[PDB]
Amino acid sequence: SSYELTQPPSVSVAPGRTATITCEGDNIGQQIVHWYQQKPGQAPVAVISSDSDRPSGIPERFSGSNSGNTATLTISRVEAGDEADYYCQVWDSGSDHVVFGGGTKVTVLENLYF
Amino acid sequence: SSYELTQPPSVSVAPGRTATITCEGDNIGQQIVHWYQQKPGQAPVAVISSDSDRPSGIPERFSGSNSGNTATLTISRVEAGDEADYYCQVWDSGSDHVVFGGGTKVTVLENLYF
Amino acid sequence: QVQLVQSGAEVKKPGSSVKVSCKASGGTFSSYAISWVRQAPGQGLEWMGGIIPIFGTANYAQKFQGRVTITADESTSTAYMELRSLRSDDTAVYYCARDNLGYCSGGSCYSDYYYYYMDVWGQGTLVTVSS
Amino acid sequence: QVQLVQSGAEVKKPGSSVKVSCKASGGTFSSYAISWVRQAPGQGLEWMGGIIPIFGTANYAQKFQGRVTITADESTSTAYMELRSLRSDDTAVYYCARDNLGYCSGGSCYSDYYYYYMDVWGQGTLVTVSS
Amino acid sequence: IRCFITPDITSKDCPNGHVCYTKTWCDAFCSIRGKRVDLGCAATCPTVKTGVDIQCCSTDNCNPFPTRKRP
Amino acid sequence: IRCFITPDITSKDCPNGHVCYTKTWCDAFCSIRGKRVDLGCAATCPTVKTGVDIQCCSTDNCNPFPTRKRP
Ligand SMILES: [Cl-]
Ligand SMILES: [Cl-]
Ligand SMILES: [Cl-]
Ligand code: NA
Ligand code: NA
């Protein structure tokens, strides 16, 4: 009936490495994808609009891309405070619905693996 | 299932007077309407594009409008040579169909009524 | 900056209804659309629907269509969500959220609707359904 | 100016098929769409369908879908319409006609299709269906 | 003359006006939100620059707000 | 790098380039025909004017032609 967005429930990232969060959908490259950050007990905050733009105030280490069947939120040189849930979002004009992905919890590890 | 355009089959116009040709459709003002002139045994010729524009070469006495449920082709100071069939046309994006009106045959009288 | 201030928490019986309000403090209430987005405990965001006051047109998620009504009172810059036939999985925090892309500006308006990203969020209203 | 030149008249038996060619001469064959429009004797214009060669995408009127195929040969700048299971009221003059609004220009292309007005017309091809 | 006026999209009496107008053009969001529409009243049909379309009309409320038809 | 290129919308090798790009903007027909799309390759991501969006990527054919989804 309606367009589907698929996010992994969880991503682990070592401190200062790159976190990458995918949002997949049938030719999602045709859609305009927005991304929200949400921390426990707080309201969501937009961090990427329109595939790749950063709202004013959002740090530069957040970046977005969208092509083919996958849109991606990339957090470079990740910091402890970036641990949060991240949701992708589109408007599906075919069904007149806003669709959210299921969310991805980014966990920033305490220690590097090796 | 497809959008429909209704034109009067025929209009009689006294020489030198104004010919008004209507093209009605449910909220046709939301459509872009084009108009074609066709004389017997010849191919059609576009005389108005995009509701109100005149292709190069077309006389200024052709003008078009489009609002609400009616689009109109107006031929001012009509001449014997303007005797022809006139068709309105839209692209209906909901049905992916080019739609033509049924055509209006303009007959130019030999004499003024009064 | 514009702010969205919601009404307080509600406890409701199954089968009853709830009406939550969202007061928009700031100039142009008519030109911006307002969505309602809920979050069940521990779960993700879910859009309920939205309204574009300048066109008086609302849109609803199919899961709730027939069960939900979204309105906007322009003289009071207040949007409302009414959700009927409540059941237990309706227990959630309900947010109002502004569409960032205004519909009118500088004497002109857009001619189609399309929900963009949501920039301003209310603080949320906890609605709990129980017996 | 670009010109569209069609093949000659054809007499066909009921139940057979006909293929009409439309050869274009000059201005970027790939980037302009071509439609087929017919006119039964004494009657009005009726769109059969069209093809946008750069995307390889054909669009047909529902009245003919399943009976008609429109193609474009980019190496010969030639468009074709084939109409199957012919019947008496397929008797008509068939025109090809170019979409005025090109799909590419200056290194870029449009990203959606939309049939605009029809500026260049072929001379027409008479197809009659008789036993 | 009475005309629709943006941004309220309401009909206003323009006691000294003569024509209603509809000015339309694309901004960067034209694909998703349609053309921008400016409705107003004037003593004469205003001029517009390239890329902008204008239609003028001379009867009350002849410039209704044109929404995009939704496929 | 291999990239799609407009207006042929075919892939070609750019042995000196390192990114593919997708540049999009609205012209006056954006509502009916969508954004204009320029696909190409470059040694580095190009800069664009206000109103123009650009996305660059660094793997082969990573800039496929984006058509508008039709409701
Ligand atoms: Cl939409
Ligand atoms: Cl202007
Ligand atoms: Cl739409
Ligand atoms: Na990044
Ligand atoms: Na005239």
What domains, with CATH codes, occur in chain F?
A: 1-71 (2.10.60.10)
Give the amino acid at B57. G
Nearest CA to C84 out of C33, C50, C24, C127 is that of C127
- Positive/negative CA dihedral, F13, F15, F20, F21: negative
Strands A84-92 and A97-100 turn out to be antiparallel
DSSP single-letter state for residue D17: -
CA triple B102-B106-B112, angle to 5 deg: 155
Structure tokens at F14: 């750019």
* Nearest residue on chain A to F67, alpha-carbon basis: A30
DSSP single-letter state for residue E69: P
* Option in A29, A65, A93 nearest F66 (CB): A29
Q: Say if the Cβ atoms of E51 and F28 lie within 8 Å.
A: yes
Domain positions in chain A: 10-108
Q: Say if the Cβ atoms of D95 and B43 lie within 8 Å.
A: yes
DSSP single-letter state for residue A93: T
Q: CB-side exposure of D90: number of CA atoms within 13 Å?
A: 24
* Option in B65, B68, B94 nearest E71 (CB): B94
What is each CA distance from B39 to A16, A96, B84, in whole angstroms? Answer: 75, 46, 5
Which residues have C-beta under 5 Å from ligand 2, the single-atom ion?
E 48-49, 52
SS3 readout for chain C: CCEEEECCCEEECCCCCEEEEEEEECCCCCCCCEEEEEECCCCCEEEEEEEEHHHCEEEECCCCCCCEEEEEEHHHCEEEEEECCCCHHHCEEEEEEEECCCCEECCEEECCCCCCCEEEECCCEEEEECC
| Resolution of the model in angstroms | 1.5
Give one DSSP letter per residue of A43-72, joined into a string. --EEEEBTTTBPPTT--TTEEEEEETTEEE
Structure tokens at F70: 């039709």
Structure tokens at E16: 């000294």
- Ligand showing the shortest atom-to-Cα distance for residue E21: 2
Spacing, Cα B33 to ligand 4 middle (Å): 47
Nearest CA to F56 out of F14, F4, F21, F16 is that of F21
SS3 readout for B50-109: CCCECCCCCCCCEEEEEECCEEEEEECCCCHHHCEEEEEEEEECCCCEEEECCCEEEEEC
CA triple C66-C68-C70, angle to 5 deg: 125
Cα dihedral value F41, F44, F49, F52, nearest 10:
50
Q: Say if the Cβ atoms of C109 and E24 lie within 8 Å.
A: no
In contact, E5 and E17? CB cutoff 8 Å: no
**Chain E contact for F54, CB < 8 A?**
no
In contact, E68 and F31? CB cutoff 8 Å: yes
In contact, A98 and C58? CB cutoff 8 Å: no
- Ligand showing the shortest atom-to-Cα distance for residue C113: 1
Q: CB-side exposure of B71: number of CA atoms within 13 Å?
A: 31
Residue at token pair 């309602």: C36
DSSP single-letter state for residue F16: T
Task: Mention every residue, 6+ apart, whose C-beta is less than 8 A from residue B56.
Answer: none
**Burial of B55: CB neighbours in 10 Å, binned 0-12, 13-18, 19+:** middle
Spacing, Cα E7 to ligand 4 middle (Å): 39
Spacing, Cα E22 to ligand 2 middle (Å): 12
| SS3 (DSSP) at D119 | strand
* Nearest residue on chain F to B92, alpha-carbon basis: F32
* Option in B43, B98, B100 nearest D44 (CB): B100
Q: State the CATH class of domain D4-100.
A: mainly beta
Nearest CA to E25 out of E8, E6, E43 is that of E6
Q: Say if the Cβ atoms of C109 and E35 lie within 8 Å.
A: no
Considering the domain C12-119 in this protein, what is its CATH number? Answer: 2.60.40.10
CA pair distance B62, B74, nearest whole angstrom: 6
Determine the number of helices (DSSP H) and then strands (DSSP E) in chain D: 0, 13
Q: Say if the Cβ atoms of E34 and F34 lie within 8 Å.
A: no
CA pair distance C60, C62, nearest whole angstrom: 6
CA distance between the termini of chain D: 40
Q: State the CATH class of domain A10-108.
A: mainly beta
What is each CA distance from C82 to C72, C79, D103, in whole angstroms? Answer: 11, 10, 47
Give the amino acid at D54. I
Nearest CA to D125 out of D3, D52, D14, D22 is that of D22
What is each CA distance from B87 to A56, B45, C104, C128, in whole angstroms? Answer: 52, 10, 36, 62
Q: How far is CA C70 from the centre of its chain?
A: 7
| SS3 (DSSP) at F38 | strand
Spacing, Cα E35 to ligand 1 middle (Å): 13
A30 contact residues in F (CB cutoff 8 A): 66-69
The distance of D75 to chain F (nearest Cα, Å) reads 14
**Chain F contact for D1, CB < 8 A?**
no
* Nearest residue on chain F to D106, alpha-carbon basis: F7
Q: Do chains D and C touch (3 or more CB pairs under 8 A)?
A: no
The dihedral region occupied by B29, where left means phi > 0, alpha psi between -120 and 50, and beta the remainder, is: alpha
Domain positions in chain D: 4-100
CA pair distance A32, C114, nearest whole angstrom: 11
Residue at token pair 């004494």: D42
* Option in C45, C47, C61 nearest A44 (CB): C45
In contact, B22 and B69? CB cutoff 8 Å: no
Nearest CA to D90 out of D10, D34, D35 is that of D10
**Chain E contact for C131, CB < 8 A?**
no
The distance of B34 to chain D (nearest Cα, Å) reads 6
Give one DSSP letter per residue of D61-92, joined into a string. -TTTTTTEEEEEETTTTEEEEEE-S--GGG-E
